[PDB]
Amino acid sequence: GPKFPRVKNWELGSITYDTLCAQSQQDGPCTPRRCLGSLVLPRPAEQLLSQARDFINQYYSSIKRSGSQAHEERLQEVEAEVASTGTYHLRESELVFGAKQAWRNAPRCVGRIQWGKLQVFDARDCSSAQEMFTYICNHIKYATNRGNLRSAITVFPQRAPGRGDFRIWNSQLVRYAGYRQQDGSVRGDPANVEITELCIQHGWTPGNGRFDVLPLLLQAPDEAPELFVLPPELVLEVPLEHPTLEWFAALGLRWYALPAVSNMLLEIGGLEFSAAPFSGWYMSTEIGTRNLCDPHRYNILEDVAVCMDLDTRTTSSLWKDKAAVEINLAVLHSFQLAKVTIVDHHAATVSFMKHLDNEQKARGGCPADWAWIVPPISGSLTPVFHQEMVNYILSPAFRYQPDPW
Amino acid sequence: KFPRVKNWELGSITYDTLCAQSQQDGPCTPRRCLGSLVLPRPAEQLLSQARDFINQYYSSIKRSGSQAHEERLQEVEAEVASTGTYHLRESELVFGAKQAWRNAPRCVGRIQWGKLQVFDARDCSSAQEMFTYICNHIKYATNRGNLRSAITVFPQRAPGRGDFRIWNSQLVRYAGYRQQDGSVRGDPANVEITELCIQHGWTPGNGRFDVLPLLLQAPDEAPELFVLPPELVLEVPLEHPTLEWFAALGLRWYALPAVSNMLLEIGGLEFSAAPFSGWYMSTEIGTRNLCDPHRYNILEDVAVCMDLDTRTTSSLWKDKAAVEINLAVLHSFQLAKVTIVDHHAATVSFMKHLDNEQKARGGCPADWAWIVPPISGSLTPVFHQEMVNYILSPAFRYQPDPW
Ligand code: HEM
Ligand code: HEM
Ligand SMILES: N=C(Nc1cccc(CNCCc2cccc(F)c2)c1)c1cccs1
Ligand SMILES: N=C(Nc1cccc(CNCCc2cccc(F)c2)c1)c1cccs1
Ligand SMILES: C[C@H](O)[C@H](O)[C@H]1CNc2nc(N)[nH]c(=O)c2N1
Ligand SMILES: C[C@H](O)[C@H](O)[C@H]1CNc2nc(N)[nH]c(=O)c2N1
Ligand SMILES: [Zn+2]
């Protein structure tokens, strides 16, 4: 019957059709001959105006003034502005709508039930690296809120004709250093080897711990990036303990409270915000499974398994699975004890299922990347594993962008 | 543009050039990826699939271009032009069956692909004969617990008639009895096949693990019912290495996974009944079959027995119970001397397979969502490996349910 993707939930037996995917203006990486859904990185003039017009149409739809005189006047304002300057500028409320929509549109985010609750800090007046730092500190303070975390984004000035970009060089506001050793191994977080060395190249005096907070390397237009040390009192961390394994605290593990992504581009109506850091709170598997157990990250599975006295000499003891579960439990327990917002992967995926239903009714579908939405432990124990998903690109969007260096 | 494929744990990069050999479309387009969906939405064409397959075969025996090769192409061509169809030689069928397995993107067990016993049952003319062949397949593949991969190929589809079909989705399936109040006793995945069995005259039991009879269908005949001799169905009682109450749950699973509802396509020819068997990867039983909410759904029972706090997700009671259940399956299969592979060993051998296939064919079609196991995903190397999904032929395909 319906000429749209049919989407099945295999746990419940229920069927929906995604009609929203029709509004996709941008190609993904798949073709009829081959699916590239699992790749992490899939490989203006009148063009701007059409993205602009579409965005303005979306704005006026969301305030229910679509076709109105205020709607037609905004369209004319935008084309006039582009006509004379090659670019245009968003009203404050358009920025707020666009940032929330970009989050709503992100297929890889399992946290989207929260999308309507986003504090948008408008930092489009920023004109130096020093001021970026003040804005970032204010963001961190607001978002951290002594452990009661609050979703926020800070938006620095858009890319502009000729002029250099605003960029935060760091991939997150909080990152632990990774120091390449003589033997070729890494102390700290191997994910951060390159940013760490950039920080040293730019004058930072390196420490030598497993959990040294990195400075921020902030770049204002047409200038070299500048180095800023976060005041330690602004970076809330949680030492890790386990509810019943008393030795786990002795491992001296910790993670920071605030996940704040700083290297993504926010695109709204064809305008490009190259510095627009955003933060929410962690889902517990990000820390306990990926950051702590990935082989190319802290890689602590075997140390924990040994402390647990498990048989690490054979795969069939399920030592990796047992250790990972206890590490995840330690993350959840430690964040709870410390009163820092965190969400477990069961609670998060249940809420994402609710989000899917809300969006089916509001927009006729919801772009979702199954490989990313399904948690990295206990996949089929969560309701999302059993849910088919349609992945597609809608704008406004958060997008990857090349590293500034 | 051929895809660049990266492993994120190791930093290594390959290029899939095999995908250019795909003739069949999947469900994705540039506008939207449908990769997570479980199911899909003339003489010249048969002749070109047939030639392509004959070519694959002679290349496989190093005999491309030979007189044997060109004469086989003429035989196939003469047969199609005259009759609209053709027939495979046994050796071609053997090669085709192994290649369809090799090409199966959802299969994590393909390191084994070269090791497949092929039973030719194309001279089968009745449901009765199908049963004899199936019994011999089970006996062979089971081998007192030392499992051996096998396929039995029944007669191909033919334009003028109904298909040979096995109605059951596996040769071994537990009954699912729907209650007056909607709920299910046994395996809810098998409610429909169970009702079909009763309706065709099977006297049902009333347990959680009642082995179903087979419904076997010869062309344009109602299916017939055949009870499997109990000695042919090897089962494993489930116990746990350290948790004594676990055996009290009364759980078991069967040794032999033997899928019997898929269509085998070779060179344009279609085998609507070609059941195949290997051995289980432990998560299929421990995680999916026993812990899926729409299956036996035992997570709560086990958590309670383990005295876990089920009042909150953040105790990870589900995760803890699931791990113990998978451990029980592995332990119990090991104790019974029945072949099984855990999800770490299986995914490690699949990585070796990806590397063998890169060297041999310049790629390997793989469906990431199916290859990564349903617990402990990122703890296995396959999670960090990009994969390219596409359809090569010979292939195993889904087909409609015959009722
Ligand atoms: C409210 C709490 C939130 C939770 C628990 C959450 C959860 C997550 C998780 C677990 C991921 C996967 C990250 C990874 O595996 O590397 C993710 C991806 C993402 N989320 Fe969120 N999210 C939250 C809020 C936000 C906010 C506030 C934004 C932006 C306004 C956001 C936008 C994104 C984007 C853009 C991605 C994709 C990153 C990529 O493609 O690489 N989310 N989310
Ligand atoms: C040797 C031991 C083998 C192991 C451990 C194994 C493992 C698996 C697993 C775990 C799956 C996913 C099944 C599911 O979740 O429903 C699978 C899929 C599959 N395997 Fe195997 N495999 C083996 C041998 C074979 C053999 C002998 C064949 C056929 C000749 C085969 C063909 C397939 C096919 C066609 C699928 C996909 C089914 C679908 O798309 O629904 N495998 N394999
Ligand atoms: N809980 C969070 N997690 C999160 C959200 C978005 C992005 C990320 C970081 N993802 C990095 C993935 C990655 C890593 C290395 C290379 C690569 F291409 C991609 C993490 C939040 C961060 C900000 C708001 S919520
Ligand atoms: N270990 C095995 N497992 C396995 C292999 C292939 C297929 C299957 C069963 N998969 C059925 C998946 C499924 C379930 C419900 C509905 C649906 F559409 C599809 C299981 C083997 C079976 C035969 C050889 S190895
Ligand atoms: C190759 C594969 O796409 C890659 O490992 C993905 C899989 N799923 C993921 N899912 C999330 N949420 N985060 C990730 O980094 C990844 N990594
Ligand atoms: C919707 C989703 O594709 C579906 O639940 C798939 C996911 N991955 C799977 N992987 C395997 N091996 N077997 C399955 O049945 C499934 N089910
Ligand atoms: Zn796809």
Q: What is the 3-state secondary structure (H, E, C) of A230-290?
A: CCHHHCCEEECCCCCCHHHHHHCCEEECCCEECCCEEEECCEEECCCCEECCEEHHHHHHH
For A78-87, give one letter per residue: b (16+ CB within 10 A) or e.
bbeebeeeeb
Q: Which residues line ligand 2 (CB under 6 A)?
A: B 101, 104, 106-109, 112, 116, 149, 151, 276, 278-279, 281, 284, 341, 346, 370, 396
Say how many CB pairs under 8 Å bridge A and B. Answer: 215
β-strand partners of B216: B166, B224
Ligand 5 atom at minimum distance from B387 CA:
1
B75 touches B32 (CB < 8 A) = no
Residues A55, A157: one domain?
yes
The terminus-to-terminus CA distance of chain A in angstroms comes to 52
Q: For residue B383, is it within any domain?
A: no
Strands A119-122 and A152-155, by their bridges, are parallel
Amino acid, res. A303: D
Ligand 2 atom at minimum distance from B396 CA:
35
A199 touches A215 (CB < 8 A) = yes
Of B36, B344, B389, the CB nearest to A320: B344
Q: For residue A30, is it within any domain?
A: yes
The secondary structure of residue B86, as a DSSP letter, is -
Q: For residue A332, is it within any domain?
A: yes
Ligand 6 atom at minimum distance from B106 CA:
12
Say if the Cβ atoms of A30 and B29 lie within 8 Å: yes
Q: Catalytic pick from B19, B102, B107, B324?
A: B107
Residue A28 tokens read as 């993904």
Amino acid, res. A115: W
Give the separation between CA A156 and CA A169, rounded to whole angstroms.
14
Q: Cis peptide before A396, with omega less than 30 degrees from 0?
A: yes
- B13 CB within 8 Å of a chain A CB: no
Amino acid, res. A93: S
Ligand 4 atom at minimum distance from B38 CA:
18
In Å, what is the CA distance from A365 to each residue of A17, A19, A20, A24?
A: 7, 6, 5, 12
Residue A316 tokens read as 């069939």
Residues A92, A36: one domain?
yes
How many domains are there within chain B? 3
Q: Cis peptide before B394, with omega less than 30 degrees from 0?
A: yes
Residue B110 tokens read as 């393909």
Smallest CA separation from ligand 2 atom 43, residue:
B107
Handedness of CA A392, A396, A400, B1 (dihedral sign): positive
Q: For residue B301, is it within any domain?
A: yes
Residues B366, B267: one domain?
yes
Residues A104, A51: one domain?
yes
Ligand 4 center to B95 CA (angstroms): 22
Residues B25, B154: one domain?
yes
Residue B304 tokens read as 């309670």
- Pick the residue from chain B with its C-alpha nearest to A380: B374
Q: How far is CA B83 from the centre of its chain?
A: 33
Ligand 6 center to A215 CA (angstroms): 43
Q: Which residues contact A154 (CB under 8 A, 6 or more apart)?
A: A121, A123, A135, A136, A138, A139, A276, A277, A278
Of A35, A375, A386, the CB nearest to B33: A35
- Pick the residue from chain A with its C-alpha nearest to B325: A318
B301 touches B250 (CB < 8 A) = no
A201 conformational bin, left if phi > 0, alpha if psi -120 to 50, beta if neither? alpha
Whether A338 is in the pocket of ligand 3, judged by its Cβ within 6 Å, is no
Give the separation between CA A351 and CA A113, rounded to whole angstroms.
6
Q: Identify which of B168, B215, B219, B213 has the alpha carbon closest to the alpha carbon of residue B189.
A: B168
A71 touches A55 (CB < 8 A) = no
- B335 CB within 8 Å of a chain A CB: no
Give the separation between CA A258 and CA A237, rounded to whole angstroms.
8
Residue B133 tokens read as 């062949």
Residue B148 tokens read as 């051996």
Q: What is the 3-state secondary structure (H, E, C) of B183-219?
A: CEEECHHHHHHHHHHHHCCCCCCCCCCCECCEEEECC
**CA Rg value for chain A:** 23
Q: For residue B393, is it within any domain?
A: no
Q: Identify which of A113, A108, A123, A125 has the alpha carbon closest to the alpha carbon of residue A151.
A: A113
Look-up of token digits 């961390």: A237
For A365-374, give one letter per residue: b (16+ CB within 10 A) or e.
bbbbbbbbbb
Q: Which residues contact B137 (CB under 8 A, 6 or more apart)?
A: B119, B150, B152, B171, B258, B275, B277
Residue to mutate among B6, B243, B308, B314, with most A CBs inside 10 A, is: B314
Q: For residue A54, is it within any domain?
A: yes
Q: Catalytic pick from A286, A290, A307, A399?
A: A286
CATH number for the domain spanning B271: value is 3.90.340.10
Give the separation between CA A270 and CA A58, rounded to whole angstroms.
13
Give the separation between CA B236 and CA B244, rounded to whole angstroms.
17
Q: Which residues contact A314 (CB under 8 A, 6 or more apart)?
A: none
Ligand 1 center to A111 CA (angstroms): 6
Amino acid, res. A29: P
Total Cβ atoms within 10 A of residue B29: 17
Q: Catalytic pick from B72, B102, B110, B173?
A: B110
Residues A65, A185: one domain?
no
Smallest CA separation from ligand 5 atom 5, residue:
B384
Residue A290 tokens read as 């990926």
Residues A157, A44: one domain?
yes
Handedness of CA A327, A328, A333, A334 (dihedral sign): positive
Residues A136, A200: one domain?
yes
Say if the Cβ atoms of A39 and B315 lie within 8 Å: no
Q: Which residues line ligand 5 (CB under 6 A)?
A: A 38, 40, 371-372; B 8, 383-386
What B317-321 contacts at long range (C-beta under 8 Å, 24+ apart), as own/partner pairs, is: B318/A346, B318/A378, B318/A381, B319/A325, B319/A328, B319/A377, B319/A378, B319/A381, B319/B375, B320/A325, B321/B291
> Coil, strand or helix: which one is B20?
helix
CATH number for the domain spanning A298: value is 3.90.1230.10
- A32 CB within 8 Å of a chain B CB: yes
Polymer length of chain A: 405
Q: Identify which of B229, B203, B192, B236 has the alpha carbon closest to the alpha carbon of residue B401.
A: B192
**Helix or strand run (H / E) with residue B77:** helix B67-83
Q: Domain range holding A93?
A: 18-124+151-161+265-279+349-373
Q: Is B349 annotated as a binding residue?
A: no
Q: How far is CA B104 from the centre of its chain?
A: 9
A109 part of the active site: yes
Say if the Cβ atoms of B376 and A28 lie within 8 Å: no
Best probe residue, ligand 6, of B38, B280, B380 (max atoms within 8 Å of C-beta): B38
The terminus-to-terminus CA distance of chain B in angstroms comes to 44
Of A370, A378, A389, the CB nearest to B318: A378
**Helix or strand run (H / E) with residue B51:** helix B43-60
Smallest CA separation from ligand 5 atom 16, residue:
A372
B284 part of the active site: yes
A107 touches B33 (CB < 8 A) = no
Residue A222 tokens read as 């047409």
- List helix spans (H) across B315-367: 317-335, 343-361
Q: What is the 3-state secondary structure (H, E, C) of chain A?
A: CCCCCEEEECCCCCEEECCHHHHCCECCCCECCEECCCCCCCCCCHHHHHHHHHHHHHHHHHCCCCCCHHHHHHHHHHHHHHHHHCCCCCCHHHHHHHHHHHHHHCCCCCCHHHCCCCEEEECCCCCCHHHHHHHHHHHHHHHHHHHCCCCEEEECCCCCCCCCCCEECCCECCCECEEECCCCCEEECHHHHHHHHHHHHCCCCCCCCCCCECCEEEECCCCCCEEECCCHHHCCEEECCCCCCHHHHHHCCEEECCCEECCCEEEECCEEECCCCEECCEEHHHHHHHHHHCCCCCCCHHHHHHHCCCCCCCHHHCHHHHHHHHHHHHHHHHHHHCCCCEECHHHHHHHHHHHHHHHHHHHCCCECCHHHHCCCCCHHHCHHHHECCEECECCCEEECCCCCC
**Helix or strand run (H / E) with residue B304:** helix B299-305
Whether B276 is in the pocket of ligand 4, judged by its Cβ within 6 Å, is yes
Q: Identify which of A227, A192, A226, A198 has the alpha carbon closest to the alpha carbon of residue A212.
A: A192
Polymer length of chain B: 403
Q: Which residues contact B285 (CB under 8 A, 6 or more apart)?
A: B253, B329
- A67 CB within 8 Å of a chain B CB: no
Q: For residue A383, is it within any domain?
A: no
From chain A, the residues in CB contact with B26 under 8 A are 32-35
A110 touches A349 (CB < 8 A) = yes
- This structure was determined by X-ray
Phi then psi dihedrals of residue B237, to 5 deg: -70, 140
Total Cβ atoms within 10 A of residue B222: 9
Ligand 4 atom at minimum distance from B262 CA:
7
Residues B51, B109: one domain?
yes
Of B16, B30, B326, the CB nearest to A318: B326
Residues A102, A140: one domain?
no
Whether A114 is in the pocket of ligand 1, judged by its Cβ within 6 Å, is yes
> Coil, strand or helix: which one is B18?
helix
A179 conformational bin, left if phi > 0, alpha if psi -120 to 50, beta if neither? beta
Ligand 4 center to B259 CA (angstroms): 6
Phi then psi dihedrals of residue A153, to 5 deg: -135, 140
> Coil, strand or helix: which one is B72?
helix
The secondary structure of residue B384, as a DSSP letter, is G
Q: For residue B389, is it within any domain?
A: no
From chain B, the residues in CB contact with A34 under 8 A are 3, 16, 19, 22, 26, 28, 388-390
CATH number for the domain spanning A171: value is 3.90.440.10
Give the separation between CA A376 and CA A114, rounded to whole angstroms.
21
Resolution (A): 2.1
Residues B155, B107: one domain?
yes
> Coil, strand or helix: which one is B396?
strand
Residue A96 tokens read as 């707020």
Of B299, B348, B377, the CB nearest to A376: B377
In Å, what is the CA distance from B190 to each residue of B196, B288, B291, B301?
A: 10, 14, 16, 22
Phi then psi dihedrals of residue A151, to 5 deg: -65, 135
Look-up of token digits 């009879």: B213
Amino acid, res. B83: T
From chain A, the residues in CB contact with B6 under 8 A are 39-41
Give the separation between CA A8 and CA B3, rounded to whole angstroms.
29
Residues A23, A157: one domain?
yes
Phi then psi dihedrals of residue A15, to 5 deg: -125, 135
A275 touches A164 (CB < 8 A) = no
**Helix or strand run (H / E) with residue B97:** helix B90-102
Say if the Cβ atoms of B386 and A290 lie within 8 Å: no
